[PDB]
Design a protein around this nucleic acid. Structure first.
Ligand SMILES: [Mg+2]
Ligand code: NA
Lengths: 77, 149, 271
RNA sequence: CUUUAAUGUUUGAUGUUCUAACGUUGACCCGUAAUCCGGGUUGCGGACAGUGUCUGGUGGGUAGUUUGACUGGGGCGGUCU
RNA sequence: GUUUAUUAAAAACACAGCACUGUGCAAACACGAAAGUGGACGUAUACGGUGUGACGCCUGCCCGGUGCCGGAAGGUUAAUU
RNA sequence: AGGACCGAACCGACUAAUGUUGAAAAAUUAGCGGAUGACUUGUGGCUGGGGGUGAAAGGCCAAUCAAACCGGGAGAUAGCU
């Protein structure tokens, strides 16, 4: 499913509102990308399905902390 | 993205400098190789102690060919050789990269890689370059004094 | 040859059959056969995704070797055979090591003739080797679009490709449609024009002849009701609109290519 | 302070090159006596393609509806303050 | 040959033939939030769409309008800033 | 040889009479078309309702079809009887 493994962002339902204020249901999808992160603690490439915001979170925190959170949450990566 | 350079980079800095590098460059090239590492405060507070080992030992043993992408083309190396080949068009032959070399035996020692394996190509109508290669057809086809010298 | 059947009945009045006597009037080679089942135009959801498909004679699939990756071993063509799965006749060929394979039949190939694969192959029809090693300006068939995949260009009955130019890693090909395309010079390709070129001249002569091949009848959009097609109803014969597909897209001129990934290999679209 | 030359230098742009993101419904190895999937090596593409948000155009393909009243039936014509 | 099972079997549908048009293969197109599948284990002598409807003689003139296609000096024009 | 001819089985359904609280919610009798093919038929499987399937009649999808049936929103609404 379209879920960011770092942040948990899912598709979220909302409205397309016309100029006549016609409300038709729609989905906002996240900006998911499958990325191979070079983990140094294991000398490996770990593939994760991550949003761009999650990638910024990885850049800030460090991949080690993010993976620690993921494995504390479960999330077989 | 602010990063501290563990080694020399072409147009960013040399041997320790908080450089504002684009996130894609840092994420995909500098950190996957041994060139830089992001400065999250604690990292520089460890770098200020690591510099004793880094700036001398690692600097002496390896300070060029950080990713063998541009330093191989700029700093010409492994020019001297003995193996010629077939007629002047290297194709699938690793040749010699370590033996019969003098400059690449002291401190900093750049390196090279292999070429395209034989599946469609052969000893005519093209050539290869003795250096690191990702492309094998559109890559530069400059003579390296190994294809026929 | 082409034979016009005499008009003993309406249905044999107009049929013209392509009769070739050198074909093999026996069974195919059993090891190189596999089951293939008809689909009726239905995908795995069970829905007709391509209309006008269903029925026809039962057919066994022949494993025809398009890669031609056995290099340096000459082969002799034992027989020419009828392939129900394509417009071209095939050739059962025996290698010097004792292995038997199927190939497409070039225009002039006949039983007893020799063939070979690889860089050190003579330029005569049936031989297969890279465009790199093939001279420019020549006629070629069964052509790869990237190395090692297996040829998939100029395969139908009398088609061929014309090697127009060579520039670096890429060779330029004129395809049978008139399109000009770049292709890597490492790509293999077979010499000569693939044969059975009189395949066009056959006329089915009756509806059942098209039913034998798996083609179900086509119903015009104008013959339908508005709920079924955009061309829909009207009292009597009425069109009053631009021609379109059943899904509303405009046929009669609108271009549908949208790739942006292979455009760099297209030198000149077909006229 | 008026004006005017250059670059380390910040983003704007055209172009060409490159590889390390990303694609591969190319080849070979392994999980594995497996046309899936994954990992790996190599080639070919390559910051293009493609996806997320936002945006202009198109859009009976689909949907929801509106299309008045008077009236010697109704409609057509006329009318309506 | 097919067709309104149960008031219409036909001049209606289909049809061999023909023309236009799209499609270079991960094809176009279709079923599918997607993965994938059909097309097709096919490759332009192929595949889809559309129209006409054996065969014979043929198929004249018009690109002003709508559509599609191609190209462009210029005008106006969104998000963003 | 033949989507050739006459004609049983088999598949159909052009005309007439009967019947229409029928023997039968579509049949009987007498005639009638095809009858080696685009035929017919048994067993099993697949396509599901804004969907399927359709040699196209808005045909067929369990005696129901210009949007099946069952249950629910639901005691919809009814300026009308
Ligand atoms: Mg069709
Ligand atoms: Na119509």
């Amino acid at each position: 499913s379209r879920v960011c493994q770092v942040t948990g962002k899912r598709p979220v339902t909302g409205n397309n509102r016309s100029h006549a204020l016609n409300a038709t249901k729609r989905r906002f999808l996240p900006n998911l990308h499958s990325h191979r992160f070079w983990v140094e603690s294991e000398k490996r490439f770990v593939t994760l399905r991550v949003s761009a915001k999650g990638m910024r979170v990885i850049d800030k925190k460090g991949i080690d902390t993010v993976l620690a959170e993921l494995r504390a949450r479960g999330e077989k990566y | 993205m602010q990063v501290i350079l563990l080694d020399k980079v072409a147009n960013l800095g040399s041997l320790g400098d908080q450089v504002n590098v684009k996130a894609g460059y840092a994420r995909n090239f500098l950190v996957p190789q041994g060139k830089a590492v992001p400065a999250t405060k604690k990292n520089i507070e460890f770098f200020e102690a690591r510099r004793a080992e880094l700036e001398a030992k690692l600097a002496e043993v390896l300070a060029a060919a950080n990713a063998r992408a541009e330093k191989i083309n700029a700093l010409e190396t492994v020019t001297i050789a003995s193996k010629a080949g077939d007629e002047g068009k290297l194709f699938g032959s690793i040749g010699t990269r370590d033996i019969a070399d003098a400059v690449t035996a002291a401190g900093v020692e750049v390196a090279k890689s292999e070429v395209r394996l034989p599946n469609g190509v052969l000893r005519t109508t093209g050539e290869h370059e003795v250096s690191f290669q990702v492309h094998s057809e559109v890559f530069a086809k400059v003579i390296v004094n190994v294809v026929a010298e | 040859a082409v034979v016009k059947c005499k008009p003993t009945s309406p249905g044999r009045r107009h049929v013209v059959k392509v009769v070739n006597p050198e074909l093999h009037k026996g069974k195919p080679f059993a090891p190189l056969l596999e089951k293939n089942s008809k689909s009726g135009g239905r995908n795995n959801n069970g829905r007709i995704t391509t209309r006008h498909i269903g029925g026809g004679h039962k057919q066994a699939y022949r494993i025809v070797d398009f890669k031609r990756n056995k290099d340096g071993i000459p082969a002799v063509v034992e027989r020419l055979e009828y392939d129900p799965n394509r417009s071209a006749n095939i050739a059962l060929v025996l290698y010097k090591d004792g292995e038997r394979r199927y190939i497409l039949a070039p225009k002039g190939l006949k039983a007893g003739d020799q063939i070979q694969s690889g860089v050190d192959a003579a330029i005569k029809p049936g031989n297969t080797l890279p465009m790199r090693n093939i001279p420019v300006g020549s006629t070629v068939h069964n052509v790869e679009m990237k190395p090692g995949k297996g040829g998939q260009l100029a395969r139908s009955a009398g088609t061929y490709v014309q090697i127009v130019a060579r520039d670096g890693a890429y060779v330029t090909l004129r395809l049978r449609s008139g399109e000009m395309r770049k292709v890597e010079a490492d790509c293999r390709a077979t010499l000569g024009e693939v044969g059975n070129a009189e395949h066009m001249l056959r006329v089915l002569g009756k509806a059942g002849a098209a039913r034998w091949r798996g083609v179900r009848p086509t119903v015009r959009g104008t013959a339908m009701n508005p709920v079924d097609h955009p061309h829909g109803g009207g009292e009597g014969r009425n069109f009053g609109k631009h021609p379109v597909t059943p899904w509303g897209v405009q046929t009669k001129g609108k271009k549908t290519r949208s790739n942006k990934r292979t455009d760099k290999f297209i030198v000149r679209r077909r006229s």
